[PDB]
Design a protein around this ligand. Sequence first.
Ligand SMILES: *[C@@H]1O[C@H](CO[C@@H]2O[C@@H](C)[C@@H](O)[C@@H](O)[C@@H]2O)[C@@H](O[C@@H]2O[C@H](CO)[C@@H](O[C@@H]3O[C@H](CO[C@H]4O[C@H](CO)[C@@H](O)[C@H](O)[C@@H]4O[C@@H]4O[C@H](CO)[C@@H](O[C@H]5O[C@H](CO)[C@H](O)[C@H](O)[C@H]5O)[C@H](O)[C@H]4NC(C)=O)[C@@H](O)[C@H](O[C@H]4O[C@H](CO)[C@@H](O)[C@H](O)[C@@H]4O[C@@H]4O[C@H](CO)[C@@H](O)[C@H](O)[C@H]4NC(C)=O)[C@@H]3O)[C@H](O)[C@H]2NC(C)=O)[C@H](O)[C@H]1NC(C)=O
Ligand SMILES: *[C@@H]1O[C@H](CO[C@H]2O[C@@H](C)[C@@H](O)[C@@H](O)[C@@H]2O)[C@@H](O[C@@H]2O[C@H](CO)[C@@H](O[C@@H]3O[C@H](CO[C@H]4O[C@H](CO)[C@@H](O)[C@H](O)[C@@H]4O[C@@H]4O[C@H](CO)[C@@H](O[C@@H]5O[C@H](CO)[C@H](O)[C@H](O)[C@H]5O)[C@H](O)[C@H]4NC(C)=O)[C@@H](O)[C@H](O[C@H]4O[C@H](CO)[C@@H](O)[C@H](O)[C@@H]4O[C@@H]4O[C@H](CO)[C@@H](O)[C@H](O)[C@H]4NC(C)=O)[C@@H]3O)[C@H](O)[C@H]2NC(C)=O)[C@H](O)[C@H]1NC(C)=O
Lengths: 172, 216, 216
Amino acid sequence: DLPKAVVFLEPQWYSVLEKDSVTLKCQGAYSPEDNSTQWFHNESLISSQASSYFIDAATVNDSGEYRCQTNLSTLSDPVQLEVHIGWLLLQAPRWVFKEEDPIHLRCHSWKNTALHKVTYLQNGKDRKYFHHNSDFHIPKATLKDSGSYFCRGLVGSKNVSSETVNITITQG
Amino acid sequence: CPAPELLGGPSVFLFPPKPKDTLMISRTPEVTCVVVDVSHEDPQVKFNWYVDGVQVHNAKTKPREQQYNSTYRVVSVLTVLHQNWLDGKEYKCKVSNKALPAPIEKTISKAKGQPREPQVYTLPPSREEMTKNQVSLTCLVKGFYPSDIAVEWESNGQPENNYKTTPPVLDSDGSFFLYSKLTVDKSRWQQGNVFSCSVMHEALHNHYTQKSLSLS
Amino acid sequence: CPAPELLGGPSVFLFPPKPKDTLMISRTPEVTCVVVDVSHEDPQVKFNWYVDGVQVHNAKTKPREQQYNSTYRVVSVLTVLHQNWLDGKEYKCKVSNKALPAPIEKTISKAKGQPREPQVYTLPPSREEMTKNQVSLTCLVKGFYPSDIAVEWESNGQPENNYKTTPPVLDSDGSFFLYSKLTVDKSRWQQGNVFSCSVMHEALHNHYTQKSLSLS
Ligand SMILES: *[C@@H]1O[C@H](CO[C@@H]2O[C@@H](C)[C@@H](O)[C@@H](O)[C@@H]2O)[C@@H](O[C@@H]2O[C@H](CO)[C@@H](O[C@@H]3O[C@H](CO[C@H]4O[C@H](CO)[C@@H](O)[C@H](O)[C@@H]4O[C@@H]4O[C@H](CO)[C@@H](O[C@H]5O[C@H](CO)[C@H](O)[C@H](O)[C@H]5O)[C@H](O)[C@H]4NC(C)=O)[C@@H](O)[C@H](O[C@H]4O[C@H](CO)[C@@H](O)[C@H](O)[C@@H]4O[C@@H]4O[C@H](CO)[C@@H](O)[C@H](O)[C@H]4NC(C)=O)[C@@H]3O)[C@H](O)[C@H]2NC(C)=O)[C@H](O)[C@H]1NC(C)=O
Ligand SMILES: *[C@@H]1O[C@H](CO[C@H]2O[C@@H](C)[C@@H](O)[C@@H](O)[C@@H]2O)[C@@H](O[C@@H]2O[C@H](CO)[C@@H](O[C@@H]3O[C@H](CO[C@H]4O[C@H](CO)[C@@H](O)[C@H](O)[C@@H]4O[C@@H]4O[C@H](CO)[C@@H](O[C@@H]5O[C@H](CO)[C@H](O)[C@H](O)[C@H]5O)[C@H](O)[C@H]4NC(C)=O)[C@@H](O)[C@H](O[C@H]4O[C@H](CO)[C@@H](O)[C@H](O)[C@@H]4O[C@@H]4O[C@H](CO)[C@@H](O)[C@H](O)[C@H]4NC(C)=O)[C@@H]3O)[C@H](O)[C@H]2NC(C)=O)[C@H](O)[C@H]1NC(C)=O
């Protein structure tokens, strides 16, 4: 036989800031009495028996591997997730992009505060700059592009930046 | 707007003790942590002090709320050991506030370099000045280090109101130096009353020296 | 109320002329308006200048594009008449750009308030100092307005390297005052070489005055 749960995060970003919020839904096959889902933190049962685990205020304690499983369903492959502390974080889905892919860099801000003259950088070099905050796309990445990114901007008078990150341009 | 205020963590400034207070055991040196831009939505602000890296929430502290433009202002007084701030221990002020995605850490200490000896000379008004109805009794402090220091003027036993002082200036001679211009009505000068310049620094035998100016 | 300030778009700073440049007709004082954080998406930046509120698009101005960290920078320099910038006309620079909701204005003017001719006195080394290898030839500028001012030192025809000067100090006497400590090797003092202090202000006959100090 072949069931097998599944986990989906929404919003799509698997990396986030505290007080940031996310929900992990568990797509599975329920069965009589067992209209219940179990949530695993790393490899451990945790309360919330919902069908969608919901994190209002996030926090690092919250970081980890979330897998789920229902009755008639197998055990969800892992979906890793992480909460980082800061005024902003660099979002992206994967970090290992094939020569020519849909790069989506998001300079996100703590408690979604507002961001001024924002910048996406790398290796230390100011790549792209926006006045009011904006996501940063690149149709198809390029190998020349590989490097270590981060962004920075303005929270009122305050100035801020993200923890660096490694984008890896592969040859396929 | 019926009063703005806003968008960023409350910011934090931390000042050092006053020079004087640092050399007169009889005086209470006090390092000071200030927090402005404190929200009306999260006035609770938490201070943690650290002597050369110590005492997370132990004690020896002191604070209390304050209104303003439309935002709060908060203080933390940390009375410190004289010799401490002399030997150069560093003072850390960790400030926490629901408005800040994380803490803020500011550290204040005393300049790197071995202290210098405060040359002190007094200067009598330039004759060219003698004309006016009040003369400029000057006294200058040359070649000292660091900038911390204070100066005053006593006529006999009582000190004077009028007079000002410049802030330390970096002398090419590696050290510092400043001036202090005492203002007295013309007469007082001529009559004869002597006048003393008072210098407080950690290089003088008793962190204290005196030099005086008179005439004829 | 205190206007809502700060929302992306390029920022704009406006600098005044250089003090000296304002008292020697022979000098071209120029007020200057910069515009940083200018997008690559809308490089076209447009300036308008206003003297005591005049000439929207007329002219007498000057600017041209410039790269950077990843953002553009742009200038406009408006040469100004001396007399004007002296009588305190006001200078307005209205910046306008695609990225801006509305345009930005920045007004720069000369120290408001009435000025005061600065008294200059020389001060010969305090005996107590005659000791050492070089003496502190002092010159003080008191009771002047405003802060702008410059001071120097010449032996006879040529000026000296060594020496420094204090920042104007806010005297109770409503005006300002500063000191200037010229340093020369003991010798020269005694030998006799005369010394002059030079003061540039907008209150001296020709914005210039001189006073000299020697031994007598
Ligand atoms: C809402 O309103 C508040 C308050 O507003 C107030 O009213 C109106 C009219 C305002 O216009 C203003 O006048 C009033 O504040 C407002 O809060 C502001 O916020 C400012 C920033 O946004 C903040 O600015 C900083 O000021 C620092 C200077 O502090 C001294 O001077 C100010 C006035 O000039 C004074 O307020 C302070 O008290 C302090 O002066 C005295 O210092 C004494 C020394 O110890 C001390 O005395 C007491 O303590 C001793 C202990 O020994 C004894 O107990 C003594 O008895 C006791 O009195 C007191 O602290 C003070 N007392 C008195 C009477 O004055 C200044 O350092 C900062 O500059 C640095 O930072 C800027 C950027 O922030 C840099 O660009 C700049 O380069 C500076 O950088 C420093 O440079 C030095 C080299 O010079 C270097 O060594 C440093 O490392 C470097 N540091 C940094 C970080 O770079 C800055 O200008 C202002 O102080 C604050 N108000 C108050 C009262 O503190 C809010 O912002 C408003 N809200 C909004 C949204 O705007
Ligand atoms: C991308 O990079 C941009 C490029 O900037 C340069 O920076 C380099 C360090 C480098 O990294 C490169 O990237 C690049 O080359 C960057 O732009 C920068 O943005 C900053 C803010 O975002 C700007 O900061 C302001 O700077 C002012 C200081 O200006 C002078 O001093 C600095 C320091 O050296 C210098 O960089 C400036 O160019 C400037 O120099 C002066 O230049 C003028 C014109 O050239 C000269 O004028 C003279 O005039 C005579 C007339 O006869 C004649 O024409 C002469 O020839 C001519 O030179 C001056 O002589 C010259 N002087 C000196 C000493 O150099 C600050 O004043 C300003 O501070 C004030 O405002 C701030 C914001 O509003 C505020 O934070 C601060 O508290 C302060 O507040 C004010 O304080 C005043 C007192 O000072 C009060 O009176 C006001 O009331 C009060 N107002 C307010 C609102 O509070 C601020 O520091 C920076 O200038 C700008 N860089 C340049 C080169 O312009 C950009 O941000 C980057 N983007 C990103 C995303 O990273």
